[PDB]
Symmetry: D2
Subunit: 182 residues, 4 copies
Amino acid sequence: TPHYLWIGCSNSRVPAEKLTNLEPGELFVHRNVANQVIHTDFNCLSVVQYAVDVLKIEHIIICGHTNCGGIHAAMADKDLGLINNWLLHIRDIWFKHGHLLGKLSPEKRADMLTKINVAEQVYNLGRTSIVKSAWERGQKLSLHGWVYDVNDGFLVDQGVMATSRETLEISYRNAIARLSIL
Amino acid sequence: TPHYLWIGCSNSRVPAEKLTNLEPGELFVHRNVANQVIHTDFNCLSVVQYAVDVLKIEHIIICGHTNCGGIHAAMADKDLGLINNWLLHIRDIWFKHGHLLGKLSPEKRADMLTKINVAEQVYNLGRTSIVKSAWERGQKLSLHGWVYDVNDGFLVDQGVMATSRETLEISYRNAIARLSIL
Amino acid sequence: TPHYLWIGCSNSRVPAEKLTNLEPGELFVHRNVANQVIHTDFNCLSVVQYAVDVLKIEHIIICGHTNCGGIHAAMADKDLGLINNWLLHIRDIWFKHGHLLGKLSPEKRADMLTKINVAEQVYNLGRTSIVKSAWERGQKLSLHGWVYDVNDGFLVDQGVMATSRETLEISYRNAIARLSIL
Amino acid sequence: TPHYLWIGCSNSRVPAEKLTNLEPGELFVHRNVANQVIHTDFNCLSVVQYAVDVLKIEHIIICGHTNCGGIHAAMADKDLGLINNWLLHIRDIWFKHGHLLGKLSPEKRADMLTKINVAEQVYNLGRTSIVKSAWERGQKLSLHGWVYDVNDGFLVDQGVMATSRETLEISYRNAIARLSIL
Ligand SMILES: [Zn+2]
Ligand SMILES: [Zn+2]
Ligand SMILES: [Zn+2]
Ligand SMILES: [Zn+2]
């Protein structure tokens, strides 16, 4: 059985098995554009549920990555059909952290939004009743939100780790605080 | 750019870049429970849309797999939270083809539904207006439905394979016809 | 508090309060294009849940109606953006009952698909774990699927009533049987 | 044809054709819990899309309402199944404006979030590529955000009102600004 859920980007360069060292078959995997955990996405939350409730997975990694098409698209004006809907959530995050991102060098803005996004998705994941329950019923379950850079390993935006709803609060607000340091 | 969208199951026992000899960086990936393409799932369809429109991918592989817990769960009566919703589509598929599955021995059954599912999902994928437009505007785009025999090689063909909406009808209906007659 | 959930079409001529005689405030209302209950629609199922679990509603009416734009669109070839995704579920129903509908007079085909649709949505609704639970925990909860005709009151396609998962099976397969009589 | 899409809450205490003096047959309606327009909700957005593209509606009224159980539930910690997912968007809105709501007395709070929600939802509705395209192609389309005071008249203005994407930014941001400053 798998012990890890990897929520990553569909992006071809970011596959769990090569960013991780996990034994073959340890990785339950969900990938979607910009590694989102939208509150009302049955797709992702079904994986999270199946992971958490069927497989009793104890680690969920939301891995985002740099130079992520989703993030760029989120920030772009292009009509990408359904992607617009999907990335609107990311734009929400973008707008929510507009103070911070406005400051940043336009190019780095994408990479910040990637870091932030992961934070937000973990925050989303961790506020899921799926995860909140796993915890509430004392199941061990750690959420991690990382950002993998194509040319750099993990951005050490480590930030995003929750093992409880409370640690989520701290980690999340903490990560957001860290990222705001500039 | 990658050349394949791989829509597969979140089941680790199916790592795409490994089980195809394809390069890492060549598989745009979406995985979800029982590798579904639900008409109204922005998650998957965003991946597809990103794949088809942004990456201009030419091959969408929906790859199911045997001993897929998704498929098993669909056939269980067990309340698996959000997953029940997700898997009710698979149960539609089960019941849609209940007669075929009725005829089958109750283990063959799972692996049949697994194959059928791939077909249904290809069919869904191909009636996507995303995929349909790609085709309508001459975008070379083939849909492929495979099942990875988890305990084995790899059924590099469920027969379902569409390079157009019409080839979709044929391939799919033929696949179903076939799978209904061994 | 409301005692009835009305899942109807967004169609302006089909508002619950005027097709029903219910006291002001008795109607929890969800309407969407072609009054669907898609397994993985958080929107509708949230209303169903809220209805069933918060409001302890004891009656869910999926009211469809004749000359329903959704149904027509379902059957039509038009690109209606997100509507295509949404009505693809209805097309599924259409294709699932293609034998029956193929027979029918093209015009009546739409009205049959409307009757069928309601059956299917109730079937969907009733296989929801929300409803299955209400029942499993002995809560009184009756699903009704009707089809209101603009010029005729209810099509007496009465069919579609479930007060239990078993009655759903019967009512549903029964309704489908009735509709197949031609 | 109807001239208004009414996006409201499933709460019966809000019947649209009645509370507006509008004709029955003039309100295309979507209702859901806390009258949300989630970027990735095909349900609502299909209604909107049908409204905007098929019915060529010129007014989308998102109408929230006071003592909205949706809003209350969002603010409760209670596990309400699928509804938690649905309401996590409202909780984002709550927390997004936590400071404002922090400042408020904990009852004003609900009715504030109710108003804020309408604004957020209008904002979401207006960043819909559905609505954005209608505008981009000169379709006369105004978005309106109202709150029906359930115990009263009707706040025929939350201030949020957009006839374009730019008027969307202004109206929305202004609404938020306002609601943050009484
Ligand atoms: Zn990416
Ligand atoms: Zn599987
Ligand atoms: Zn209709
Ligand atoms: Zn309400």
